[PDB]
RNA sequence: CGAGGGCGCACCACCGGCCCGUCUCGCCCGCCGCGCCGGGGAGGUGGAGCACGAGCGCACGUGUUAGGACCCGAAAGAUGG
RNA sequence: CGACCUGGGUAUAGGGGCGAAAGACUAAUCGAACCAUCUAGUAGCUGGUUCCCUCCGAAGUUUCCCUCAGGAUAGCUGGC
RNA sequence: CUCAACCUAUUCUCAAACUUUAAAUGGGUAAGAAGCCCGGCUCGCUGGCGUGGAGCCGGGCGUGGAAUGCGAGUGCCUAGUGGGCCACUUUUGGUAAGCAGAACUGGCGCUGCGGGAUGAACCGAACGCCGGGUUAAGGCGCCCGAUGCCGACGCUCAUCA
RNA sequence: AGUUUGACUGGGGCGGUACACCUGUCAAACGGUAACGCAGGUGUCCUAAGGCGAGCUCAGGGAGGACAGAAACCUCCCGUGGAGCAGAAGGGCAAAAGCUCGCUUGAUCUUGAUUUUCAGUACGAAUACAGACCGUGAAAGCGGGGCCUCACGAUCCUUCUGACCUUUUGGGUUUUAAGCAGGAGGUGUCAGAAAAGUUACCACAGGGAUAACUGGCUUGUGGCGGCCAAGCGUUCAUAGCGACGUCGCUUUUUGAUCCUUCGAUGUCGGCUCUUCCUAUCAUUGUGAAGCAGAAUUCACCAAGCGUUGGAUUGUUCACCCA
RNA sequence: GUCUACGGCCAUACCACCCUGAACGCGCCCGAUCUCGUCUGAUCUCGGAAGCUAAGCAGGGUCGGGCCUGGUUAGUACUUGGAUGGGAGACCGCCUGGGAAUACCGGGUGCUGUAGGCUU
């Protein structure tokens, strides 16, 4: 799919439609001090081996793309997460498609 | 085994009649549906929005809610050993007024008028319907014409 | 196995509890013994208050 | 053979009290005779109530009795309850009441009597009104019990507001998955 | 005996009302702390709620469950000899 | 007449020993001895499950389950 | 001049995954008092309008508005079961099967009894302990109850009837 | 050293996925309805192929027009859709839902109700509303994704976003951490364990719910017959045969099934021995011939009597010698 | 008797060819300054009024096609329920009720609502 780098959509903070910059959300790095990570490290320390399941049975070949929208108002930099459907190839701000155009030889 | 698709087996059920495709006639949009009237859920296939499920095609219900384009219908559905009253939102293209209720209302109005008139005229009249009684005793004239003798025909091999 | 409506119960009987059961058949005897000891102590501290300081 | 079903032949109902209380059985004898030998339907209702169990004879509070006896046209009528009359400490003014009850709490009895009222047992009620004339037959709230909070549709079905059975109440006891949209679903 | 009429228990269906959470809208009020303070309203909606208590204790029955768990039954595993 | 047969004395002990090797032998037991204990181990599996009369009276189907010899669930049953 | 194609009007034969037409059996609803008809009030909804709709408050109407049968409503706790099989008819796979798989009703399982010599399911009929009477399905030479009727009309000879 | 090494399954394994879904049919004109039933499809694709408005008409054909021809473009006429609408199929659709333009981001922010599967649980998908903020159009309106039916995912953990929000334990400030609400990272065995073999050295609990041998149903296949008669038979259908077809029988073949047996019915062959069958090889008595005789062939009554000795091979079968 | 504007049902209204059309009307028609669109004032938009019913349109016609509605097909096909009916089967008959579709042969060829005109 292809989505433009900007869109005019509702901003919850302003309470109205505003322009938003659209980027692709990428998962942040693990904190190492989140409570689940702390519990996991305590559980793993010592003897006993692996104590939690390790998935290793992947079936999906795609992910749901998440668009990070940022309100372009300087007084309101409010962000949001928009999920679009699964797609193998995703492009941000690609070239628009044309109708009466010759296919390249 | 069978799929659970919402329109499985509706190939003829939601199809249009022969030479009755195209634009929906506008009297169907002009019908007035109030709360409490009885409607048959047909389910035409030209309009896909607000379409009833196939288990409600051919079922009759009572309107309980009216919106801009649809009505809410309380319609009985039988699920194994229980009948339970479902509430479904159906666009007005897929319903029409049931004429059984129209005929009954006509009969009630006739009965009330006849009772009010009969008390004034004095005598008594019959208001309940009755099942078709045994035929009365009557005479059959021959009109000087002998009844025609009927004889079974011989067998012949047609083709 | 759960059977219809009920309360999710968590009995703490997974730990060989039958070896550590404290019966109380010596409770009346203990009451008698403590009462007799109280009487003896009160006799021992003859004019001093029985309950203590 | 005949084509009938026999699974509803025996009607399930109290034909006598399950109680062995001899005073209750004596006044059951009394009201059995009254029901048989009078045409009053009050006696029949009272007898069938005497047969009933304790959960089918819920207590009647003083406040509820006063409220039902304050209704128009019930002045100088005998309030009859087949059960216990209970003091209600939420009321302050007790009017003059003529009352017939199977049991009366000691505080309720003292309040009624100091208000100038009168208390009768059911044998005294039979001697006073053998047909139940001039009575208001009251009943305590039959569904005012904790079990009726758990009765009904299961707690985990949509549009059910029935209490679940939990050993404890708190934020860790049956509040996460199936109770809020954040944890799976809510219904 | 009685056509009609009345007060209506419990319970049921429905409509209102109130309490806590959470949204939307909006104008007020309070003061030894004038605040990034406190209180209030209307309209939806979430609650195992209120709406003149029904519980507590004891006994009995049934059902489920943890325990040797209705009775008898492995191949095995562990500790110490 | 030999890598010969044999007595007694010694050494090696159980996941160990010993094996010119067959998983052989290790007190009639060996692809892990024997003894006691943990232990009445667990069993969705097999077998059994003790007096009388009266009344009512089924299911082998739905949905979910590493589910298919089992359960939960609805249905059908009885009692109050 | 001939043979093709093509067109036109006809002609033979078909369809579970074709169809103009289109049954039977079948599925829903209605057959009143919560109804019908009068007045009035409320609304922040709707709006040319005393509009529309809904709600509410009074009043009047009983020939109780098809047949037939039956007393209904409602709650709690709950065991067993969750291997099924058979028959008429419909029906899928298979050459077929006492095969495998569906639909409908009944049955066996859980069920004895009369008949089918015999037999889980077929036909009749379902059951407390008895006497009398009468039947069902089926029978009435003898086994073996009952034709030991002067039964009626025909057909048929089989050295595998 | 500890553990695991899925399920369904006309036994199991191998093979497939009938394991989560969608279309048509089965399906017996409401709905529902099975088999490792049939014909197929799915894990995507799309800033437009989403949303409005406007204007057009498609496939195909006919007749014409420089190069230009069976297909290049242009014009007229016919054209109920015989095209297209992303894909499987079905439904639907014509100043549409298709094609071309213009403007856009309703593919946005929220609370509930409902439908579908259904236990009337969830997920997914969907319908009708209500409250915001917007788009488009002159407007009526239409739009909170794709014309409809599929295109997907819990707890725990992580990550991001939001409230000058709550807590962070004697108080306060600040980091940090924990919460509340909404997205995402996934469990395809798709209501969601973290999982390789081998055992003939084997063990146990069981199973005739389930295979290998008998038996039973069946008879495709094997074997043995019949009917018709185009032909073969120097001629001549039928002495003897029998193509195309078609009707049977048999249970000495092999399949099919899984009813009995898994707290055991000893599983090949030979040897020994008895009996039975006839679909008769010989012998007795006959009939027919393309029966001159001899020999042979066909058929009938017929199972009384007989049907052998050996080489090779475990063989049953087979083949040869005699 | 008709038409125009907006329609309801959506062929008894459609399609092919022929004939007639008074009066209004509806059109064809004349032009591009403005409004507005085009390669093209052809369409669309706008300003008109010389001509014409040739066309659209209306009405009528056709042993017209279609469509609508009857008869026939036919109590046929199929079918609810029944039998210890028949038949080796395949299937068939009867009892009890219901009951079609072609071919073929007839008749018909728009009804109508609101508002406004013309028609002596
Ligand atoms: Mg849509
Ligand atoms: Mg002390
Ligand atoms: Mg019974
Ligand atoms: Mg309420
Ligand atoms: Mg219980
Ligand atoms: Mg035991
Ligand atoms: Mg272990
Ligand atoms: Mg070995
Ligand atoms: Mg043991
Ligand atoms: Mg699982
Ligand atoms: Mg078993
Ligand atoms: Mg079967
Ligand atoms: Mg059984
Ligand atoms: Mg039974
Ligand atoms: Mg029986
Ligand atoms: Mg018998
Ligand atoms: Mg027999
Ligand atoms: Mg008798
Ligand atoms: Mg006999
Ligand atoms: Mg005899
Ligand atoms: Mg014969
Ligand atoms: Mg059907
Ligand atoms: Mg159906
Ligand atoms: Mg358009
Ligand atoms: Mg909206
Ligand atoms: Mg699953
Ligand atoms: Mg078996
Ligand atoms: Mg053969
Ligand atoms: Mg010849
Ligand atoms: Mg043996
Ligand atoms: Mg033997
Ligand atoms: Mg012979
Ligand atoms: Mg014609
Ligand atoms: Mg018939
Ligand atoms: Zn903003």
Curated annotation (Swiss-Prot), chain A:
<dbReference type="GO" id="GO:0003735">
    <property type="term" value="F:structural constituent of ribosome"/>
</dbReference>
<dbReference type="GO" id="GO:0006412">
    <property type="term" value="P:translation"/>
</dbReference>
<protein>
    <recommendedName>
        <fullName>Large ribosomal subunit protein eL42</fullName>
    </recommendedName>
</protein>
<dbReference type="GO" id="GO:0022626">
    <property type="term" value="C:cytosolic ribosome"/>
</dbReference>
<dbReference type="InterPro" id="IPR000552">
    <property type="entry name" value="Ribosomal_eL44"/>
</dbReference>
<dbReference type="InterPro" id="IPR053708">
    <property type="entry name" value="Ribosomal_LSU_eL42"/>
</dbReference>
<keyword id="KW-0687">Ribonucleoprotein</keyword>
<dbReference type="GO" id="GO:0002181">
    <property type="term" value="P:cytoplasmic translation"/>
</dbReference>
<dbReference type="GO" id="GO:0003723">
    <property type="term" value="F:RNA binding"/>
</dbReference>
<keyword id="KW-0963">Cytoplasm</keyword>
<comment type="function">
    <text>Component of the large ribosomal subunit. The ribosome is a large ribonucleoprotein complex responsible for the synthesis of proteins in the cell.</text>
</comment>
<comment type="subunit">
    <text>Component of the large ribosomal subunit.</text>
</comment>
From Swiss-Prot, chain B:
<keyword id="KW-0225">Disease variant</keyword>
<keyword id="KW-0256">Endoplasmic reticulum</keyword>
<dbReference type="GO" id="GO:0006412">
    <property type="term" value="P:translation"/>
</dbReference>
<feature type="compositionally biased region" description="Basic and acidic residues">
    <location>
        <begin position="111"/>
        <end position="122"/>
    </location>
</feature>
<dbReference type="GO" id="GO:0005737">
    <property type="term" value="C:cytoplasm"/>
</dbReference>
<dbReference type="GO" id="GO:0022625">
    <property type="term" value="C:cytosolic large ribosomal subunit"/>
</dbReference>
<keyword id="KW-0689">Ribosomal protein</keyword>
<dbReference type="InterPro" id="IPR008991">
    <property type="entry name" value="Translation_prot_SH3-like_sf"/>
</dbReference>
<dbReference type="GO" id="GO:0005829">
    <property type="term" value="C:cytosol"/>
</dbReference>
<dbReference type="GO" id="GO:0005783">
    <property type="term" value="C:endoplasmic reticulum"/>
</dbReference>
<comment type="subunit">
    <text>Component of the large ribosomal subunit.</text>
</comment>
<comment type="function">
    <text>Component of the large ribosomal subunit. The ribosome is a large ribonucleoprotein complex responsible for the synthesis of proteins in the cell.</text>
</comment>
Curated annotation (Swiss-Prot), chain C:
<comment type="function">
    <text>Component of the ribosome, a large ribonucleoprotein complex responsible for the synthesis of proteins in the cell. The small ribosomal subunit (SSU) binds messenger RNAs (mRNAs) and translates the encoded message by selecting cognate aminoacyl-transfer RNA (tRNA) molecules. The large subunit (LSU) contains the ribosomal catalytic site termed the peptidyl transferase center (PTC), which catalyzes the formation of peptide bonds, thereby polymerizing the amino acids delivered by tRNAs into a polypeptide chain.</text>
</comment>
<feature type="modified residue" description="Phosphoserine">
    <location>
        <position position="51"/>
    </location>
</feature>
<protein>
    <recommendedName>
        <fullName>Large ribosomal subunit protein eL13</fullName>
    </recommendedName>
</protein>
<comment type="similarity">
    <text>Belongs to the eukaryotic ribosomal protein eL13 family.</text>
</comment>
<comment type="subunit">
    <text>Component of the 60S large ribosomal subunit (LSU).</text>
</comment>
<feature type="modified residue" description="N6-acetyllysine">
    <location>
        <position position="15"/>
    </location>
</feature>
Curated annotation (Swiss-Prot), chain D:
<dbReference type="Pfam" id="PF17135">
    <property type="entry name" value="Ribosomal_L18"/>
</dbReference>
<dbReference type="GO" id="GO:0005783">
    <property type="term" value="C:endoplasmic reticulum"/>
</dbReference>
<dbReference type="GO" id="GO:0016020">
    <property type="term" value="C:membrane"/>
</dbReference>
<dbReference type="GO" id="GO:0022626">
    <property type="term" value="C:cytosolic ribosome"/>
</dbReference>
<feature type="modified residue" description="Phosphoserine">
    <location>
        <position position="129"/>
    </location>
</feature>
<dbReference type="InterPro" id="IPR021131">
    <property type="entry name" value="Ribosomal_uL15/eL18"/>
</dbReference>
<feature type="cross-link" description="Glycyl lysine isopeptide (Lys-Gly) (interchain with G-Cter in SUMO2)">
    <location>
        <position position="118"/>
    </location>
</feature>
<keyword id="KW-0832">Ubl conjugation</keyword>
<feature type="cross-link" description="Glycyl lysine isopeptide (Lys-Gly) (interchain with G-Cter in SUMO2)">
    <location>
        <position position="163"/>
    </location>
</feature>
<dbReference type="GO" id="GO:0005829">
    <property type="term" value="C:cytosol"/>
</dbReference>
<feature type="modified residue" description="Phosphothreonine">
    <location>
        <position position="157"/>
    </location>
</feature>
<keyword id="KW-0687">Ribonucleoprotein</keyword>
């Amino acid at each position: 799919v292809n989505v433009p780098k900007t869109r005019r959509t509702f901003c919850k903070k302003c309470g109205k439609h505003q322009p938003h910059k659209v980027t692709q959300y990428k998962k942040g790095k693990d904190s190492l001090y989140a409570q689940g990570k702390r519990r996991y490290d305590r559980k793993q320390s010592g003897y006993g081996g692996q104590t939690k399941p390790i998935f290793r049975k992947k079936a999906k070949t795609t992910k749901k793309i998440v668009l990070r929208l940022e309100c372009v108002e300087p007084n309101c930099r409010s962000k949001r997460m928009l999920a679009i459907k699964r797609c193998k190839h995703f492009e941000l701000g690609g070239d628009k498609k044309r109708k009466g155009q010759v296919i390249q030889f | 085994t069978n799929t659970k698709g919402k329109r499985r087996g509706t190939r003829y059920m939601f199809s249009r009649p022969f030479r009755k495709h195209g634009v929906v006639p506008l009297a169907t949009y002009m019908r007035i549906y109030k709360k409490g009237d009885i409607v048959d859920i047909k389910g035409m296939g030209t309009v896909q929005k607000g379409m009833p499920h196939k288990c409600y095609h051919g079922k009759t219900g009572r309107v309980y809610n009216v919106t801009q384009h649809a009505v809410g219908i309380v319609v009985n559905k039988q699920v194994k050993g229980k009948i339970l009253a479902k509430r479904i939102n159906v666009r007005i293209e897929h319903i029409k007024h049931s004429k059984s209720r129209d005929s009954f209302l006509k009969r009630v109005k006739e009965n009330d008028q006849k009772k009010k008139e009969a008390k004034e005229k004095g005598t008594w009249v019959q208001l309940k319907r009755q099942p078709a009684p045994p035929r009365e005793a009557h005479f059959v004239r021959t009109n000087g014409k002998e009844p025609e003798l009927l004889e079974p025909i011989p067998y012949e091999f047609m083709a | 196995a759960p059977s219809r409506n009920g309360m999710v119960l968590k009995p703490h009987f997974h730990k060989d509890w039958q070896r550590r059961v404290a019966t109380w058949f010596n409770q009346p005897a203990r009451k008698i013994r403590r009462r007799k000891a109280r009487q003896a102590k009160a006799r021992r501290i003859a004019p001093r208050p029985a309950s203590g300081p | 053979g005949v084509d009938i079903r026999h699974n509803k032949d025996r009607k399930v109902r109290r034909k006598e009290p399950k109680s062995q209380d001899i005073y209750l059985r004596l006044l059951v004898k009394l009201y059995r005779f009254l029901a048989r030998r009078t045409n009053s339907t009050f006696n029949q209702v009272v007898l069938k109530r005497l047969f009933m169990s304790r959960t089918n004879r819920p207590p009647l509070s003083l406040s509820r009795m006063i409220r039902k006896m304050k209704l128009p046209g019930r002045e100088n009528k005998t309030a009859v309850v087949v059960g216990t009359i209970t003091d209600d400490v939420r009321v302050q003014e007790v009017p003059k009441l003529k009352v017939c009850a199977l049991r009366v709490t000691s505080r309720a009895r003292s309040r009624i009597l100091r208000a100038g009222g009168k208390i009768l047992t059911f044998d005294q009620l039979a001697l006073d009104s053998p047909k139940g004339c001039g009575t208001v037959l009251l009943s305590g709230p039959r569904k005012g019990r904790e079990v009726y909070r758990h009765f009904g549709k299961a707690p985990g079905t949509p549009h059910s507001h029935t209490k679940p059975y939990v050993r404890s109440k708190g934020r860790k006891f049956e509040r996460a998955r199936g109770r809020r949209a954040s944890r799976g679903y809510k219904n």
